[PDB]
């Protein structure tokens, strides 16, 4: 099915403690493949997955050029924001950006993104048509107006339907053995008495890729949305992921509860009972 490429970047101002640090990473799907750290002492875009090292030195020469560039740009943008918002020059502020594209089963273009966030909150972002902009407050409209007289959407739209799609498609062949796998979750159940009246039932899903997964409990076929304890999908390290779901149940009733798993690498959804 589909695939996605994402670059995420964080600039952070540290006044007095020196200069805005700038960190950027790239993903295909849920696998990190490149990075850039403004405080690295290397000042080169670095590899992070094995299948990106096959790219030659002109690649690393290029990408380092684009992402050192953008780093200085946002470093100034941090100043423009502290202007538009009337903030003091002793506080730390964060500038975050993501952009990328999603493609179908054929490698055709599907949807593109180009968004910014100041200090944890939506600032400006490109619409779905990739023609118009969505500013989030007054300061971002000053910037929204600037970026329509400049036809910046035109520019970013050109990158997304072309360069973004082209390069992902390339990486999807370079790493087809890592990136086109789907690993189904191995699943088990655990069980523990809290009191002499109750017990916990924990439904575990280990070692799957990609990250999407659903884990839901039921009692006599009834969704137990509010008594369920459900953790964030977490990374194992090797590039698989983990997730579990937990219910407290009364001692002697563990047979009415069931736990359902859905994943890509599962033909049929699974069901697990204690």
């Amino acid at each position: 099915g589909s695939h996605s490429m994402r670059y995420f970047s964080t600039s952070v101002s540290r006044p007095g403690r020196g200069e805005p640090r700038f960190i950027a990473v790239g993903y295909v799907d849920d696998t990190q493949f490149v990075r850039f750290d403004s405080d690295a002492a290397s000042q080169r875009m670095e590899p992070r997955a094995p299948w990106i090292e096959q790219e030659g030195p002109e690649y690393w020469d290029e990408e380092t050029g684009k992402v050192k560039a953008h780093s200085q740009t946002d470093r100034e943008n941090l100043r423009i924001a502290l202007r538009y918002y009337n903030q003091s020059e002793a506080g730390s502020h964060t500038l975050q950006m993501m952009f990328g594209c999603d493609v179908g089963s054929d490698g055709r273009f599907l949807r593109g993104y180009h968004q910014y966030a100041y200090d944890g909150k939506d600032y400006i972002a490109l619409k779905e048509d990739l023609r118009s902009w969505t500013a989030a407050d007054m300061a971002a409209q000053i910037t929204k107006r600037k970026w329509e007289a400049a036809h910046v959407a035109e520019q970013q739209r050109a990158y997304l339907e072309g360069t973004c799609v082209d390069g992902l498609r390339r990486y999807l062949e370079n790493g087809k053995e890592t990136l086109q796998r789907t690993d189904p979750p191995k699943t088990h159940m655990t069980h523990h008495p809290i009191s002499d009246h109750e017990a916990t039932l924990r439904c575990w899903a280990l070692g799957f890729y990609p990250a999407e997964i659903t884990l839901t409990w039921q009692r006599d076929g009834e969704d137990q949305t509010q008594d369920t304890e459900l953790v964030e999908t977490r990374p194992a390290g090797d590039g698989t992921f983990q997730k579990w779901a937990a219910v407290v149940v009364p001692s002697g009733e563990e047979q009415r509860y069931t736990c359902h798993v859905q994943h890509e690498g599962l033909p049929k959804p699974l069901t697990l009972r204690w």
């Binding site: 790239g26 990408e63 946002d74 000053i142 910037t143 082209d166 390069g167």
Partner: peptide
């Protein structure tokens, strides 16, 4: 492949 163009606010 990183982006090509970058704008100021």
């Amino acid at each position: 492949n990183y982006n090509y163009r970058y704008r100021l606010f």
